[PDB]
Amino acid sequence: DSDLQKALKKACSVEETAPKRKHVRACIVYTWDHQSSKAVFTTLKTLPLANDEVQLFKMLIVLHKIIQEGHPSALAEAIRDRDWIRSLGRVHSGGSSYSKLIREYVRYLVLKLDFHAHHRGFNNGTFEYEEYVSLVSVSDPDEGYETILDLMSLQDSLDEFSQIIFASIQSERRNTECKISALIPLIAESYGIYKFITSMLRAMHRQLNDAEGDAALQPLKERYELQHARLFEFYADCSSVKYLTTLVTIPKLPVDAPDVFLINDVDE
Amino acid sequence: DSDLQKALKKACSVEETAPKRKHVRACIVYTWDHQSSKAVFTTLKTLPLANDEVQLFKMLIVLHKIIQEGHPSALAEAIRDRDWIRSLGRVHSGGSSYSKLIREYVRYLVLKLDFHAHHRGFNNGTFEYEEYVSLVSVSDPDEGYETILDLMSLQDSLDEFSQIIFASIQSERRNTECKISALIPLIAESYGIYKFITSMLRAMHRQLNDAEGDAALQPLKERYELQHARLFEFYADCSSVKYLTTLVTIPKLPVDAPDVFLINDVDE
Amino acid sequence: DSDLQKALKKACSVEETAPKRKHVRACIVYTWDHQSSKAVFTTLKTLPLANDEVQLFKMLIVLHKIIQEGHPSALAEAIRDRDWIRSLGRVHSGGSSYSKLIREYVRYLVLKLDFHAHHRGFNNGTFEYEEYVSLVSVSDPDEGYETILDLMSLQDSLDEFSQIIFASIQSERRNTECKISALIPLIAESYGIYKFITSMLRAMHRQLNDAEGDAALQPLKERYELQHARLFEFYADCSSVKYLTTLVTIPKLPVDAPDVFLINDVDE
Amino acid sequence: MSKQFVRSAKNLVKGYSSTQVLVRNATSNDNHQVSKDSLIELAEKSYDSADFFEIMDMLDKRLNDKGKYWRHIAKALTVIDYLIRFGSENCVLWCRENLYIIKTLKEFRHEDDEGIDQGQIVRVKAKELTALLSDDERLNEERNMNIKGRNRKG
Amino acid sequence: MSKQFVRSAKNLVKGYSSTQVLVRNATSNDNHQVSKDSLIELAEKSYDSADFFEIMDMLDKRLNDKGKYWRHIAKALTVIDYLIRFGSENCVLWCRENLYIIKTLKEFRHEDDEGIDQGQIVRVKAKELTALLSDDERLNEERNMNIKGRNRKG
């Protein structure tokens, strides 16, 4: 417990560049362990309370990794406490790029914490073709309508995220090591959300006869379909914007679309 | 606005001893003024956000003075923002006396902010014999039941305040300039609350025929009467405890009691 | 996984005296952890395979601690593999004390592994007055008859253990550091088994009306009652035998007996 | 007598905290045992995180040190026990979570150099420490006695 | 280790009896405690007048010796206690008459030189010795156990 906390202090420190990935493991391993699962999250409460947005910026990139990989119990940890990062409302920083980005970025993560309030079960990491480990494609009709609507609120927030920044990202408003570090988890999640929803549809149309709730499907698909055009423009502009051309920074969206709409309306 | 903010910075600074009372005036005058009434309260949000409980301790003694004297609009200022001083939950400090006192003291003031949520109108400073300026003794029967019940929650919190400290106050757990500074406003309010309630009863029994709501009076008086014994012991113990023997630190409670119970039950 | 295995190698080594208890923790912590729970038990298969009964003697004292404290999943680990320590059948060693003790001691632990085959749930560590965490006093009537009968086979093995040694223990046939090290877990378990059974009876007689299976109780109690006399003589002789007078080496058995028989027959 | 002045000088040069000095002072080279009054001062000043986490960490490390340092092991257990009774609420809350770790400090065998079981004194003192922590209800009762007792006086 | 060989050499020159050598051997300079097996040999050979009277007289004198010799006091009480249980009939009969004298060995305070209460270990061991001798019936029961127990084996 004490030795594990020391690893967090060294890794999540003020060193401009991104932390060592190997050091992150030892910190983010202690979560499936049913020994305590508290000491890790204790230090992640007093530090966001601080006013500075330098250490806090790098603090919110580790949570974004643990939430996309770790057990869903980790998500449940920061639910019993209603307050998370709301104290960052109304703040003032040096450059205009800082505060303008923080004010919206801080609320994007709040939605991710609110994601567990409704869906609870782990979503971002349950394969594409699986029934047992996945709790989305084979959920209750009531839960199925809720888990998709929750993902919509998170997906639409990506457009809202770029709204306050305008155009898309702008390298001029994102030219530091701390800022570019937090861009990768946002994109990896964005493509993840896009993947796990359309992957459900691949299993949904297959399992139509063995189900009970056809009415609560078409509105979910229709709303998600319109988001494609919004997401295509998001990355098309990002591609034009000068940035590191990594697979995790600019994935390819257009893959499932013409053979999804037609096959779904047949059931209705 | 800018010059007025400078007065706050100099007065509310880390200088151990209490601030200059003359300097406080210029800061607490700007409240009846309908020019802005914002710049004063802006600086009282980012500073309580800090983790240290030294500057924060002296910060919460000025608000206690302005709330007992200023316009009720000042109370209305910190209502639109739901968050006030809740961030101080779960903290750790040097001596045991600090955290044990802060955890309850921070919630005592929250109740004072919640006081405006129900009663709204100014209570702690409306004379003892007045009808026009007072909005308690001549309020609606619905408001009358609410304004007293709200004062009960504040009055009972005084017993809760001494519960976590035990015995009463203990000079050993209150032997610094910052701690003794915050004791005076707590006592002045405690005697104030006790005064403005029993003063209402002096006018209540006088105005019985010219009213409409006899049923919603006896439960209010009965509950308040039992608090007398709790309050008598509070100051009786405080008198024994070694502390500055000032009128504002140890007022005399027993004055209205035997000629209040008998005269009220006649109406029923 | 690799670093944890190194702790086992250093602790469970040939150093005559007992290993460091602090070092044992790090090894026996990795069991509630749902990361792998395999690498720990892998090294505990190739080492018992060896013919020497010196390192093996100290190897079987750690398992006796982890089985009385750890999660019941640890017990489930060595069930899928039918073979455990049967290879030690028909062996030959230096002194007569060694082989005569090993041949029976090796089978005593086999029964402990066979304990999980029937009862499965954790028995040796579920408090004396608890319903939720305990799975003995509030089990199915079919399971209740099985869990007690299994404990009987383990309890009777204690008498069988001392049978091949005769008298009781004999310090002359137990005068080495390795031999006295394995005596403490055997006794701690012996008193544990005696405790958790009679503790169930304390809750059993309380919960008679709220149950369904009175017939399958009297035979369980009657058989367990006769074992008291056998157990009393076991420790009475042990007390006479010169050995370390520790609470964990010679607990006091006679505590629940006259106020147990009479209260149970009333229900019948 | 003479080694004490030298030990204190080394601590001042390095610049250890107030807690680390008192812990090192308790683990003295001399044969004389630690005082009970010194345990009271530590118990009262064991609330802060910066102090408490250091106190628990140091005393745990004092249990090993080296083969020769046997006095440093016995004195550590004496301090830990008193920090549970008259310590603070934060002491108990942390010990409750770390009870799983503290529990494994009973079978502490050791041999310095010549051939004298120095862990005999350690084993006895540690046995009492584990016995008190094993009973959760007993710990709660001790808290009420120290809290109310302190309030009775002041 | 080295002082033991020198001590034994001095005894041979003076020419002490077999009992006096074993008593002096029990009161060794080394920190290691006396063995229990050595107490058995003394108990069996504590029948004769020439041996018994010397054993009781020497061990009584070992309690004082000098300020520095503190180990010589604790070891003496260990030997005396065992000579009552598994000793002989003559041991008990003499101790019964001299019980009036032996009784006054409870409040034995002492301070060597520096300032360490060495009599703390002495007081505890002596307390048990007086407790056993105080009960006459208990002594009689112990005799039967040792006599019959010896006859059981041979």
- CATH number of the domain to which D53 belongs: 1.25.40.90
Residues 6+ apart with CB under 8 A from C127: C133, C134
Can you read off the two tokens belonging to residue A91?
């703040």
- Determine the structural domain holding residue E95 and report its residue range: 1-147
What is the nearest CA distance from C232 to chain D, expressed in angstroms?
25
Other C-beta atoms within 10 Å of B248: how many? 12
Contact status, residue A79 vs residue A50, Cβ threshold 8 Å: no
Which residues of chain B does A49 touch, with a Cβ-Cβ cutoff of 8 Å? 49, 51, 87
Other C-beta atoms within 10 Å of C198: how many? 20
- Per DSSP, B88 falls in state G
Please report which helix (H) or strand (E) contains residue B30, including its range: none
Other C-beta atoms within 10 Å of C86: how many? 11
Which residues of chain B does A46 touch, with a Cβ-Cβ cutoff of 8 Å? 51
Domain annotation covers residue D56: yes
Contact status, residue B101 vs residue B179, Cβ threshold 8 Å: yes
Read off the amino acid at residue E36: K
Distance of alpha carbon E92 from alpha carbon E103, whole angstroms: 14
Nearest to A213 by CA among A131, A112, A144: A144
Read off the amino acid at residue C267: D
Nearest to B185 by CA among B76, B71, B62: B62
Q: Point out the residue among D63, D101, D109 whose CB comes nearest to the CB of C25.
A: D101
Which residues of chain B does D45 touch, with a Cβ-Cβ cutoff of 8 Å? 95
> For E58-102, what is the HEC assignment?
HHHHHCCCCCCCCHHHHHHHHHHHHHHHCCCHHHHHHHHHCHHHH
Name the method of structure determination. cryo-EM
Domain annotation covers residue E118: yes
Contact status, residue D126 vs residue D105, Cβ threshold 8 Å: yes
Interface contact flag, C32 A33, Cβ < 8 Å? yes
Terminus-to-terminus CA distance in chain A, angstroms? Answer: 55
Alpha-carbon separation of residue B46 from A49, A268, B11, B98, E21 (angstroms): 11, 56, 17, 21, 85
Which residues of chain E does D115 touch, with a Cβ-Cβ cutoff of 8 Å? 32
Chain D residues in contact with chain C using a Cβ-Cβ cutoff of 8 Å: 63, 100-101, 104-109, 111
Domain annotation covers residue E152: no
Nearest to B165 by CA among B157, B173, B154: B173
Contact status, residue D6 vs residue D14, Cβ threshold 8 Å: no
Nearest to C15 by CA among C259, C229, C236, C181: C181
Domain annotation covers residue D153: no
> How remote is the C-alpha of A248 from its chain's centroid?
13
Interface contact flag, B87 A90, Cβ < 8 Å? no
Please report which helix (H) or strand (E) contains residue D84, including its range: helix D71-85
Neighbour-count burial of A30, counting CB atoms closer than 10 A to its CB (0-12 exposed, 13-18 middle, 19+ buried): buried
Q: Which long-range contacts (CB under 8 A, 24 or more apart) does B193-197 make?
A: B193/B124, B193/B151, B193/B154, B193/B155, B194/B155, B194/B231, B194/B253, B195/B128, B196/B123, B196/B124, B196/B126, B196/B128, B196/B136, B196/B151, B197/B148, B197/B151, B197/B155, B197/B224
Contact status, residue B228 vs residue B257, Cβ threshold 8 Å: yes
Length of chain A: 268
Alpha-carbon separation of residue C118 from C17, C77, C121, C122, C197 (angstroms): 36, 14, 9, 11, 16
Chains interfacing with B (3 or more CB pairs < 8 Å)? A, D
Which residues of chain C does A34 touch, with a Cβ-Cβ cutoff of 8 Å? 32-34
DSSP D15-77: T--HHHHHHHHHS-SSSSPPPSHHHHHHHHT--SHHHHHHHHHHHHHHTTS-SS--HHHHHHH
- Per DSSP, A246 falls in state -
Nearest to A50 by CA among A13, A94, A87: A87
Distance of alpha carbon A178 from alpha carbon A170, whole angstroms: 15
In A166-248, which residue ranges form alpha helices assigned H by DSSP? 177-181, 183-204, 218-240
Interface contact flag, C32 A29, Cβ < 8 Å? no
Distance of alpha carbon B86 from alpha carbon A262, whole angstroms: 53
CA contacts within 13 A on the Cβ side of B10: 14
- Please state whether at least 3 CB pairs lie below 8 Å between chains C and B: no
What is the nearest CA distance from D127 to chain A, expressed in angstroms?
24
Helix A258-265 to helix A183-204 angle, to the nearest 10 degrees? 40
Domain annotation covers residue D154: no
Neighbour-count burial of D91, counting CB atoms closer than 10 A to its CB (0-12 exposed, 13-18 middle, 19+ buried): buried
Q: How many CB pairs (< 8 A) connect A and B? A: 16
Contact status, residue B49 vs residue B87, Cβ threshold 8 Å: yes
Which residues of chain A does B50 touch, with a Cβ-Cβ cutoff of 8 Å? 51
Residues 6+ apart with CB under 8 A from B205: B260, B263, B264, B267
Nearest to A16 by CA among A229, A167, A178, A135: A178
Domain annotation covers residue E136: yes
Chains interfacing with E (3 or more CB pairs < 8 Å)? D
Nearest to C152 by CA among C105, C118, C104: C118
Contact status, residue B186 vs residue B162, Cβ threshold 8 Å: no
What is the nearest CA distance from C24 to chain D, expressed in angstroms?
8
Domain annotation covers residue D143: yes
> How remote is the C-alpha of B49 from its chain's centroid?
22
Length of chain E: 154
Helix C183-204 to helix C218-240 angle, to the nearest 10 degrees? 150
Alpha-carbon separation of residue D122 from B165, C185, D63, E142 (angstroms): 38, 21, 9, 34
User: Which residues in D22-51 are b (16+ Cβ under 10 Å) and which e?
Assistant: bbbebbbeeeeebeeeebeebbebbbbeeb
Read off the amino acid at residue C232: F
> For chain C, what is the HEC assignment?
CHHHHHHHHHHCCCCCCCCCHHHHHHHHHCCCCCCCCCHHHHHHHHCCCCCCCCHHHHHCCCHHHHCCCCCHHHHHHCCCCCCCCHHHCCCCCCCHHHHHHHHHHHHHHHHHHHHHHHCCCCCCCCCCCCCCCCCCCCCCHHHHHHHHHHHHHHHHHHHHHHHHHCCCCCHHHCCCHHHHHCHHHHHHHHHHHHHHHHHHHHHHCCCCCCCCCCCCCHHHHHHHHHHHHHHHHHHHHHHHCCCCCCCCCCCCCCCCCHHHHHHHHCCC
Smallest CA–CA distance from D30 into chain E, residue: E116
User: Which residues in E128-144 are b (16+ Cβ under 10 Å) and which e?
Assistant: ebeeebeeeeebeebbe
Smallest CA–CA distance from D54 into chain A, residue: A2
Nearest to A84 by CA among A120, A54, A59, A121: A59
| Residue located via tokens 């005393």 | D59
Look at phi and psi of residue A101 and say left if phi exceeds 0, alpha if psi is from -120 to 50, else beta: alpha
Domain annotation covers residue E73: yes
Chain D residues in contact with chain E using a Cβ-Cβ cutoff of 8 Å: 31-32, 115-116
CA contacts within 13 A on the Cβ side of B242: 6
Length of chain D: 154
Alpha-carbon separation of residue B53 from B64, B92, B161, B176 (angstroms): 17, 10, 18, 13
CA contacts within 13 A on the Cβ side of A152: 15
**Cα-flanking dihedrals φ and ψ of residue D85, to 5°?**
-75, -70
> How many domains are contained in chain D?
1
Can you read off the two tokens belonging to residue A118?
């409704």
What is the nearest CA distance from B90 to chain D, expressed in angstroms?
11
Give residue numbers after which chain B breaks (C–N above 2.5 Å): none
Contact status, residue E7 vs residue E24, Cβ threshold 8 Å: yes
Contact status, residue C154 vs residue C191, Cβ threshold 8 Å: no
Distance of alpha carbon A12 from alpha carbon C87, whole angstroms: 52
Contact status, residue A101 vs residue A107, Cβ threshold 8 Å: no
Distance of alpha carbon A86 from alpha carbon A103, whole angstroms: 10
Chain E residues in contact with chain D using a Cβ-Cβ cutoff of 8 Å: 31-32, 115-116
Contact status, residue A250 vs residue A187, Cβ threshold 8 Å: yes
Nearest to E72 by CA among E46, E34, E117: E34
Smallest CA–CA distance from E32 into chain D, residue: D116
> How remote is the C-alpha of B17 from its chain's centroid?
22
Can you read off the two tokens belonging to residue B143?
């408001």
Read off the amino acid at residue B166: F
Distance of alpha carbon C123 from alpha carbon C145, whole angstroms: 14
